[PDB]
Amino acid sequence: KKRLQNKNSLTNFAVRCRLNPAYKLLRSLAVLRMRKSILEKSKNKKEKRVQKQIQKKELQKINHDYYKGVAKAVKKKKKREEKKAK
């Protein structure tokens, strides 16, 4: 067949839906999800944030343990150096 212009399979909508029969459904779902009203998110941000207090505490604890382990390595190496100073 005669070679024609290679359409952009990403931005040319007709050829994109030709290549991916599910793309128009996926794109409509994403757009519809985008179109949700700001009131629900504004009123539920605190509800969706307050669930993570326990995760924040556990996260703080693991980073605290890591910092403490590093500091104890610091102290052990300093103690060994002071031992070998004499």
Partner 1 sequence: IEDMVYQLYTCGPVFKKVNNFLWAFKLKPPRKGFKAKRHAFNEPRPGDWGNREAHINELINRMI
Partner 2 sequence: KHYNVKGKKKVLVPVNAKKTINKKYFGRKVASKKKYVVQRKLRKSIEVGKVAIILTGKHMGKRCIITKILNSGLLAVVGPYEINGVPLKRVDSRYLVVTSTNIFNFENIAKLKDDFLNYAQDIDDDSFIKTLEIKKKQKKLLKFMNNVIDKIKEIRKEDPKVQKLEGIQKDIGSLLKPEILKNKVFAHYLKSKFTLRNDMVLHKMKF
Which of residues 11, 54, 83, 84 is near RNA by CB under 7 A? 11
Rule CB under 8 A: say whether 8 interacts with partner 1.
Answer: no
The interface partner of residue 45, options being RNA, partner 1, partner 2, none and the CB cut-off 5 to 8 Å by kind, is RNA
The residue type found at 13 is F
| Shortest CB 27 distance to RNA, Å | 4
Which of residues 8, 20, 44, 63 is near partner 1 by CB under 8 A? 20
CB-based contacts of 15, cutoff 8 Å, min separation 6? 7, 8, 9
Q: Provide the token pair at 53.
A: 């207090």
Is the separation of the CB atoms in 16 and 10 below 8 Å? yes
